[PDB]
């Protein structure tokens, strides 16, 4: 078990509702980590984050390397995503060209195929939770609100009410449960945001967003890559059993076969050089 004194802490990388992420160098190895620190006095979320991430082993996810605790804090040692949030780049450039939209959408699809293959729902997929490593490949994070579906019971629905209003699925709002397909709804919101520069359901307060989501009230700007618009229209479907990529639609094969992805080589995506964003 590692201890606080094993590290030299540097700058704060970010802060959550009740967590702080700090850049740290391990003295004995000289390795850099992002260490997420939670105050104890301020817990199933930390445990859930631990349990879910301990199960993951794919290049498109932040890795959990170690954990420890002292009387005051819980520490999670994570890989450092040097380039930060995908959201920063969307806001910086305003929107992504077709090549970049395609590449990053493909990486998210690949990541979700892996995650869903393990029977795990993310439930809070959004650009803020898609980080970028030094090589500009994605590193999905924020698993404290993810759910491992029980294989013993062939569980499909998760009952915890979690998410972010702009990306939350209509089934969680209306039926009070989410499923793997709920992440494909979020994917469609993210692809839309990459191209249009804002997510599709927008308002100055959450209730107004919920009202639009449940009615599928959104529009495309006049210029939007046509095959990408088709893909978004096959993801933003109210009926969770009718989204391209979902189990009832026969899984990731048909999604990866969408015309928007025609030029994608799905194998070794993580070994390709990402396209420059501008
Ligand atoms: N592995 C990482 N590498 C680099 N930066 C990170 C890493 N993990 C988190 N961060 C940064 O720290 C911020 C806070 O992370 P944390 O997961 O502790 O809280 P959060 O869940 O994002 O915040 P909230 O609880 O308010 O939604 C993130 O938004 C991100 O910018
Ligand atoms: Na969060």
UniProtKB/Swiss-Prot annotation:
Homodimerization regulates its activity by maintaining the kinase in an autoinhibitory conformation. The 14-3-3 protein YWHAQ acts as a negative regulator by association with the residues surrounding the Ser-160 residue. STRAP positively regulates its activity by enhancing its autophosphorylation and by stimulating its dissociation from YWHAQ. SMAD2, SMAD3, SMAD4 and SMAD7 also positively regulate its activity by stimulating its dissociation from YWHAQ. Serine/threonine kinase which acts as a master kinase, phosphorylating and activating a subgroup of the AGC family of protein kinases. Its targets include: protein kinase B (PKB/AKT1, PKB/AKT2, PKB/AKT3), p70 ribosomal protein S6 kinase (RPS6KB1), p90 ribosomal protein S6 kinase (RPS6KA1, RPS6KA2 and RPS6KA3), cyclic AMP-dependent protein kinase (PRKACA), protein kinase C (PRKCD and PRKCZ), serum and glucocorticoid-inducible kinase (SGK1, SGK2 and SGK3), p21-activated kinase-1 (PAK1), TSSK3, protein kinase PKN (PKN1 and PKN2). GO terms for molecular function: 3-phosphoinositide-dependent protein kinase activity; ATP binding; phospholipase activator activity; phospholipase binding; protein serine kinase activity; protein serine/threonine kinase activity. The modification N6-acetyllysine is found at residue 223. The modification Phosphothreonine is found at residue 273. The modification Phosphoserine is found at residue 160. ATP binds at residues 17-19, 36, 79-81, 85, 128, 142. The keyword Ubl conjugation applies. Its EC number is 2.7.11.1. It comes from the Eukaryota. The PH domain plays a pivotal role in the localization and nuclear import of PDPK1 and is also essential for its homodimerization. It is a peripheral membrane protein. Keywords: Acetylation, Activator, ATP-binding, Cell junction, Cell membrane, Cytoplasm, Kinase, Membrane, Nucleotide-binding, Nucleus, Phosphoprotein, Serine/threonine-protein kinase, Transcription, Transcription regulation, Transferase, Ubl conjugation. Residues 38-76 are annotated as: PIF-pocket. It is an enzyme of class 2 (transferase). One of its GO terms (cellular component) is cell projection. Belongs to the protein kinase superfamily. AGC Ser/Thr protein kinase family. PDPK1 subfamily. Homodimer in its autoinhibited state. Active as monomer. Interacts with NPRL2, PPARG, PAK1, PTK2B, GRB14, PKN1 (via C-terminus), STRAP and IKKB. Interacts with SGK3 in a phosphorylation-dependent manner. The tyrosine-phosphorylated form interacts with PTPN6. The Ser-160 phosphorylated form interacts with YWHAH and YWHAQ. Binds INSR in response to insulin. Interacts (via PH domain) with SMAD3, SMAD4 and SMAD7. Appears to be expressed ubiquitously. This is 3-phosphoinositide-dependent protein kinase 1. It comes from Homo sapiens. Induction: Stimulated by insulin, and the oxidants hydrogen peroxide and peroxovanadate. It catalyses: L-seryl-[protein] + ATP = O-phospho-L-seryl-[protein] + ADP + H(+); L-threonyl-[protein] + ATP = O-phospho-L-threonyl-[protein] + ADP + H(+).
């Amino acid at each position: 078990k590692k201890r606080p004194e094993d590290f030299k802490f540097g700058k704060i990388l970010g802060e959550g509702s009740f967590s702080t992420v700090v850049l740290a160098r391990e003295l004995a190895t000289s390795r850099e980590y992002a260490i997420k620190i939670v105050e104890k006095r301020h817990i199933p979320y930390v445990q859930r984050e631990k349990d879910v991430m301990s199960r993951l082993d794919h290049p498109f996810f932040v890795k959990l390397y170690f954990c420890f605790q002292d009387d005051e804090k819980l520490y999670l040692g994570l890989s450092y995503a040097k380039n930060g949030e995908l959201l920063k780049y969307i806001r910086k450039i305003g929107s992504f060209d077709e090549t970049c939209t395609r590449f990053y959408t493909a990486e998210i699809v690949s990541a979700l195929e892996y995650l869903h293959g393990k029977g795990i729902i993310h439930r809070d997929l959004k650009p803020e939770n898609i980080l970028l490593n030094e090589d500009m490949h994605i590193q999905i994070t924020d698993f404290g609100t993810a759910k491992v579906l029980s294989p013993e019971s062939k569980q499909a629905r998760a009952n915890s009410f979690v998410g972010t209003a702009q990306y939350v699925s209509p089934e969680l709002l209306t039926e009070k449960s989410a499923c793997k397909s709920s992440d494909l709804w979020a994917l469609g919101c993210i692809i839309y945001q990459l191209v249009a520069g804002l997510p599709p359901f927008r308002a100055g307060n959450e209730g107004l967003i919920f009202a639009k989501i449940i009615k599928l009230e959104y529009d495309f700007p006049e210029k939007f890559f046509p095959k990408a618009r088709d893909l978004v229209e096959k993801l933003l479907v109210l009926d969770a059993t009718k989204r391209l990529g979902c189990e009832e639609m026969e899984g990731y094969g048909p999604l990866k076969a969408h015309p928007f992805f025609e030029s994608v080589t799905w194998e070794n995506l993580h070994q390709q050089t990402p396209p420059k964003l501008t």
